[PDB]
Amino acid sequence: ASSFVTISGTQFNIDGKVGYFAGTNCYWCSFLTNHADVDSTFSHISSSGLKVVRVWGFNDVNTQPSPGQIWFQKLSATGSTINTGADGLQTLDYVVQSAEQHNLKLIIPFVNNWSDYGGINAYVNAFGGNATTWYTNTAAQTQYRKYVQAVVSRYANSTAIFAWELGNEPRCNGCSTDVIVQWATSVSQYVKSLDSNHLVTLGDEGLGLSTGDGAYPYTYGEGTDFAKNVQIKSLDFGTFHLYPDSWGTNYTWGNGWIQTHAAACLAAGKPCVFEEYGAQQNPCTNEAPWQTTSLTTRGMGGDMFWQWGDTFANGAQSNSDPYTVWYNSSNWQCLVKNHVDAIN
């Protein structure tokens, strides 16, 4: 069966089945130009038992790239352009076509907080201000909402969308936490006005929560208040990410991070998604306990490791980083096949 993804209780209902899910992050799937490479990668994710894939819904530039290169939007002070050609959103159309064929669902964010594939910084280059005034910059928000409409209107009636996501890891360094509350409230209401079929979520890391141990990720220096954000009526579930190597914490501290976020989602009456995580050293040893904590904590609806790695018919490998779990490797057995077997 194929239906729209909804919430039943504090769990997700995916194609009629209510219960915990495992998924993965594949940002780079959206920029593949050979259809055979999207089909082999999605065949491997589906046969491993994963049900949800997170892909980028953006690729922002200030100058058009070399001919043949993918770009979704060019941001300029004298008129921006949204690319719907073969080197533009037609690459994302194939990803949604392949998810429909393979019975997979997709989480799709509209902008990056960081400068990879343009981000907030590509809007600042075109419309001025800086990375914290971006949220209230009228020319930047007018173009961001025109790009949201261009992506949402393509797939609004497709059953392969798990959720729309306002951005990857939005932050407002040193800002009052109300700047992201008011922006996320207005933009999620706009997404719901374009599409009443699909769930909407923020895409934040989960920073700012007072029931923890006081380490930096629980404090309020990045402009976000997790409990305030998940109470917004037009956000349907909470997201949180986990990277002890970048945040100055040890790996076992991650279990309490999952438990505190789960409890804050369940207090707001909604599921949480453990949407990104990784350990640079010994990932099988250090990330397996996190997957067991998430599966056995009330308030959790599913988890998605960062990130899938795969290889193609011509012998090329995908994009990758030190957190890649390569399909069919010993870390795939440990963190993918053994975890799907424990879920069901």
Ligand X SMILES: OC[C@H]1O[C@@H](O[C@H]2[C@H](O)[C@H](O)[C@H](O)O[C@@H]2CO)[C@@H](O)[C@@H](O)[C@@H]1O
Report the binding-site residues for substrate: 169-171, 205, 247
Annotated catalytic residue 169? yes
**What φ, ψ does residue 124 adopt, rounded to 5°?**
-60, -40
Q: Could you identify the residue written with the tokens 């989602």?
A: 265
Q: Verify binding: residue 114, ligand X, rule CB under 6 A.
A: yes
Annotated catalytic residue 276? yes
User: 237: which 2 tokens?
Assistant: 């579930």
Q: Decide: 221 and 231 in contact? Cβ < 8 Å.
A: no
136 binds, among ligand NAG, ligand X, none (CB under 5 to 8 A by kind): none
The three state secondary structure string of 155-222 is HCCCCCEEEEECCECCCCCCCCCHHHHHHHHHHHHHHHHHCCCCEEECCCCCCCCCCCCCCHHHCCCC
Q: Verify binding: residue 48, ligand NAG, rule CB under 6 A.
A: no
* Region label for 317, one of left (φ > 0), alpha (ψ between -120 and 50) or beta (otherwise): beta
CA angle, 201 as apex, 198 and 203 as ends, to 5°? 140
196 binds, among ligand NAG, ligand X, none (CB under 5 to 8 A by kind): ligand NAG
Binding mask 234-273 for ligand X (x = CB under 6 A): ---------x--xx--------------------------
197 binds, among ligand X, ligand NAG, none (CB under 5 to 8 A by kind): ligand NAG
Q: CA 97, CA 160: separation in Å to the nearest integer?
A: 8
The distance of closest approach from Cβ of residue 316 to ligand NAG in the complex, given in angstroms and rounded to an integer, is 13
Q: Find the catalytic residue in 165, 222, 276, 287.
A: 276
The distance of closest approach from Cβ of residue 86 to ligand NAG in the complex, given in angstroms and rounded to an integer, is 26
The distance of closest approach from Cβ of residue 157 to ligand NAG in the complex, given in angstroms and rounded to an integer, is 4
Q: Verify binding: residue 133, ligand NAG, rule CB under 6 A.
A: yes
Q: Verify binding: residue 6, ligand NAG, rule CB under 6 A.
A: no
114 binds, among ligand X, ligand NAG, none (CB under 5 to 8 A by kind): ligand X
3-state secondary structure of 259: helix
Cα–Cα nearest to 183, from 126, 145, 129, 227: 145
Q: Which of residues 176-205 bind ligand X (CB under 6 A)?
A: 205
Residues that are catalytic: 169, 276
Q: Which residues of this chain interact with ligand X, rule CB under 6 A?
A: 114, 169, 205, 243, 246-247
